[PDB]
Design a binder for this molecule. Structure first.
Ligand SMILES: Cc1nc(Nc2n[nH]c3c2CN(C(=O)N[C@H](CN(C)C)c2ccccc2)C3(C)C)c2sccc2n1
Length: 314
């Protein structure tokens, strides 16, 4: 089962195991580290993986953890993704107790950027929480886990739980997230699942003394039980709180394109393929998420880190 995969990657330690597992690995042609999520097809739950793949094939963003390569044997599925060394936002909050307003703003703008983009493309994430945000090599946030996306109860909006409106529910989840960043605990919690549900429907929460009046006001706009009264994604982008100490709205548009190609990465792939430029371009622009896609995108990442755009051809 690991046979096709080992043509392309050096497998290292397994660094996470859940109900899928995650293996660290090196991509041989570029020497870049990657993180391969591995699913068994017999013990699976399945169309959750299919949703995620098709979402990550169509989404590409500076704050979305990038998919490079999809492989499938008769009993396994491999998703080769960006390696984020910094770990989960959840763990970071635990280590810090809570973030100050300033640092919360820094991280939160990155969350809003990703979710605004996901929404611009016609998806809702639907499982936004700090476990699904990872710090990359530059301590920048990356959104993961698009399995429940569409065209955790503590983070679910009241209307989503009542089963009735996807863009608004993400704003609620972001509101819960915002609270957890600045407080270190959830605004609605209970051991009993139905009592928690009840608390969420009421929409009443403790407001700690250390929150600034601006924070409080924004939380209140985000955590409106009625989604019609809830602040929209658009108005969140240039909200006074979000703008404080930046003075410009969240830059949400993608800087990682499908249409434009990097000339140096194309040149290097051309020599490997003994290809003409125009035909190497057409081949890359099919975006099949095969080894070409992976090698092209990992060369770009190499370039972005100030390393030479070079394949290791042995
Ligand atoms: C496991 C782990 N991953 C790390 N970095 C990562 N880089 N790239 C990725 C991760 C984690 N990823 C991931 O899909 N995790 C899922 C999260 N699901 C449950 C919401 C997961 C975690 C554990 C077991 C199965 C699946 C991707 C994006 C591949 C890092 S950094 C320091 C520790 C560490 N531990």
């Amino acid at each position: 089962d690991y046979d096709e995969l080992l043509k392309y990657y050096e497998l290292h330690e397994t660094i996470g195991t859940g109900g899928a597992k995650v293996k660290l690995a090196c991509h041989i042609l570029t020497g870049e580290m990657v993180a391969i999520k591995i699913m068994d097809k017999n013990t699976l739950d399945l169309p959750r993986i299919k949703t995620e793949i098709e979402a990550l094939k169509n989404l590409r963003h500076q704050h979305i953890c990038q998919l490079y390569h999809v492989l499938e044997t008769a009993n396994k599925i491999f998703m080769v993704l960006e390696y984020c060394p910094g770990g989960e936002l959840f763990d970071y909050i635990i280590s810090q107790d809570r973030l100050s307003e300033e640092e919360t703003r820094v991280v939160f703008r990155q969350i809003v950027s990703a979710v605004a983009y996901v929404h611009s493309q016609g998806y809702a994430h639907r499982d936004l929480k700090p476990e699904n945000l990872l710090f990359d090599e530059y301590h920048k946030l990356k959104l993961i886990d698009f399995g429940l996306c569409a065209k955790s109860l503590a983070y679910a909006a009241p209307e989503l739980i009542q089963g009735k409106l996807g863009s608004e529910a993400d704003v609620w989840s972001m509101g819960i997230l915002l609270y957890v960043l600045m407080c270190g605990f959830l605004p609605f919690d209970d051991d009993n699942v139905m009592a928690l549900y009840k608390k969420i429907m009421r929409g009443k929460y403790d407001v700690p003394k250390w929150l600034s009046p601006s924070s409080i006001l924004l939380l209140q706009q985000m955590l409106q039980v009625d989604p019609k009264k809830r602040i929209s994604m658009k108005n969140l982008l240039n909200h006074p709180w979000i703008m404080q100490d930046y003075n410009y709205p969240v830059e949400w548009q993608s800087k990682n394109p499908f249409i434009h190609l990097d000339d140096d990465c194309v040149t290097e792939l051309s020599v490997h393929h003994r290809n003409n430029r125009q035909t190497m371009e057409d081949l890359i622009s099919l975006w099949q998420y095969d080894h070409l896609t992976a090698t092209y995108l990992l060369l770009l990442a190499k370039k972005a880190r100030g390393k030479p755009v070079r394949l290791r051809l042995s």
